[PDB]
């Protein structure tokens, strides 16, 4: 009912959601009563085999992930899909005995929706875990910006810069590809804008830090001024990174 929130999810489930709607258009909403559905044992046994596989691949993920939220949230989706499968199977049987069975049609619709819905939940949960990984990179840059305060040597500054360079570059790549995958254009705009702002402030931060280190070890002058520009750049960067974290979590 909502737009699938990534392009991958949309290309997987969008075909299925449409087919389900076409099935409903007939049969249910009071319309094509008394039609006659053929034997569905074949196509249901194939869904059943795909359900098995999905649950296989999923239970390997669960016992293998570090993500504790993932570990908890996947199992319910497995239940929803197996339970929806169980109706599809009862529908195959019911239609074998009566091609005109109306409970068989209701089960078939409910079942199909349950497969869609449970597979949607399984993919969302998985996606959420991928997003938390990007948020891990973001919070580590945030933590590290907190430590710009304690840099006072040129040697400190160059270590700070060596360790910050990879973090920023990994983040930039992650947000770039994430943004591409999104299906809400306004969410891409925010991530690109916030990111572009962080990127452009990075060299300003380093220049601000050079300035503060240099004014400090020339042993006096406008140190209070150099201090509040470095601080502003860190508050402004941390603000954007936080905005990035918030917007990544939208769906």
């Amino acid at each position: 009912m909502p737009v699938f929130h990534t392009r991958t999810i949309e290309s997987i489930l969008e075909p299925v959601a449409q087919q389900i709607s076409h099935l409903v258009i007939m049969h249910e909403e009071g319309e094509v009563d008394g039609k006659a559905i053929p034997d569905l044992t074949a196509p249901v046994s194939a869904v059943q085999a795909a359900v098995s596989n999905l649950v296989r691949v999923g239970k390997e993920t669960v016992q293998t992930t570090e993500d504790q939220i993932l570990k908890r949230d996947m199992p319910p989706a497995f239940i929803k899909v197996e339970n929806a499968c169980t109706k599809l199977v009862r529908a195959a049987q019911m239609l074998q005995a009566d091609p005109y069975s109306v409970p068989a049609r209701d089960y078939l619709i409910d079942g199909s929706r349950g497969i869609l819905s449970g597979t949607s939940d399984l993919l969302l949960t998985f996606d959420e875990a991928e997003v938390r990984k990007i948020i891990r990179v973001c919070k580590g840059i945030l933590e590290y910006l907190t430590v710009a305060e304690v840099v006072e040597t040129m040697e400190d500054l160059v270590t700070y810069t060596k360790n910050l360079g990879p973090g920023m570059t990994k983040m930039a790549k992650m947000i770039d590809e994430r943004q591409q995958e999104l299906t809400h254009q306004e969410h891409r705009v925010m991530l690109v804008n916030s990111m572009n702002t962080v990127k452009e402030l990075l060299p300003v931060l380093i220049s601000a830090m050079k300035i503060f280190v240099t004014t400090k070890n020339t042993k006096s002058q406008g140190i209070e001024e150099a201090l509040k520009n470095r601080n502003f750049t860190v508050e402004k960067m941390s603000a954007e990174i936080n905005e990035i974290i918030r917007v990544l979590q939208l769906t």
Binding site: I12, Q19, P43, L54, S112
Partner: peptide
Amino acid sequence: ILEAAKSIAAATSALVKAASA
């Protein structure tokens, strides 16, 4: 789960195609 989910989608769409054949 991407290949697992593609396969369940392909299987379900095909089921749902055979229920209007």
